[PDB]
Design a protein around this ligand. Structure first.
Ligand code: CA
Length: 282
């Protein structure tokens, strides 16, 4: 049944349930992603934060010996994907995979080790075909990183990836350029293409990415910008559609692209103008 979150605290939530910009309420089916696991591959998650309501658990830490989010990005992106107040899929389960340190850096091998851990965990949980991974990090082109990302998807885990923030073609970035991932560019509240977003033919769609408010370690909230903020909207929408329509991980990017509306103004040439839409027809 339809649930309405009135005056939602981040414009990105109300945008994705509306065909037109300027909406204030977020409208979604009560299934709300329940029973879907989302792996947050990032700086860690403040799993005690009220916004997760006990649905966040600690998976692994390949970066250091401190099992907390000392940066903030990992909590913020998990919150956009699945937080009660700030999130898309408000009943999904969330698993922290900490692969970056408190300063937001980590080596490719630490990231890949976290991705590998998550694939194993999803098999052990029986979540193959109904699992989601969010990667709001990116770097220079790397065949090894692209192989690892492709393996995640081939193993039955949907993978949403930030396109990057260097205002360039995302084909020069990994894992944005990897086979079969869902690569997400950042939009603004006026439906423009954010000035920093990477673009090009590897981008599958846009999602809200500028001035996105979500949870921050220690119980408050923070407003941030980047394609890092855009990707978890799509991670949450995938979990939502899996629990609602039963779409599988291998088809979820294509289904999101099919539902998306051609709303972006002034998208760079050769770049889709499709914007995330949850299909609610409110
Ligand atoms: Ca793609």
């Amino acid at each position: 049944a339809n649930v309405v979150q009135r005056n939602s605290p981040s414009w990105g939530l109300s945008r994705i349930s509306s065909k037109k910009s300027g909406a204030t309420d977020y409208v979604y089916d009560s299934t709300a992603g329940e029973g879907i696991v989302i792996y947050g591959v990032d700086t860690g998650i403040d799993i005690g934060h009220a916004d997760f309501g006990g649905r966040a658990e600690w998976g692994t830490n390949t970066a250091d010996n401190d099992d907390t989010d000392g940066n903030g990005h990992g909590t913020h992106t998990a919150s956009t994907a699945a937080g009660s107040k700030f999130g898309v899929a408000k009943k999904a389960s969330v698993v922290a995979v900490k692969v970056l340190g408190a300063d937001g850096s980590g080596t490719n091998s630490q990231v890949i080790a976290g991705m590998d851990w998550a694939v194993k965990d999803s098999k052990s949980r029986g979540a193959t075909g109904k699992s989601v991974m969010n990667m709001s990090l990116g770097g220079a082109y790397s065949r090894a990183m692209n192989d690892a990302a492709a393996n995640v998807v081939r193993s039955g885990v949907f993978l949403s990836v930030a396109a990057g923030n260097e205002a360039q073609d995302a084909s020069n970035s990994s894992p944005a350029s990897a086979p079969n991932v869902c690569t997400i560019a950042a939009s603004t509240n006026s439906d423009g293409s954010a000035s920093f977003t990477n673009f090009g033919s590897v981008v599958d769609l846009y999602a809200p990415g500028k001035d996105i408010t979500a949870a921050y370690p220690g119980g408050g909230s923070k407003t941030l910008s980047g394609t890092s903020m855009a990707a978890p909207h799509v991670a949450g929408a995938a979990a939502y559609l899996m629990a609602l329509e039963g779409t599988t991980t291998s088809s979820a990017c294509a289904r999101i692209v099919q539902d998306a509306i051609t709303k972006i103004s002034g998208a760079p040439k050769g770049t889709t103008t499709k914007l995330l839409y949850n299909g609610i027809n409110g």
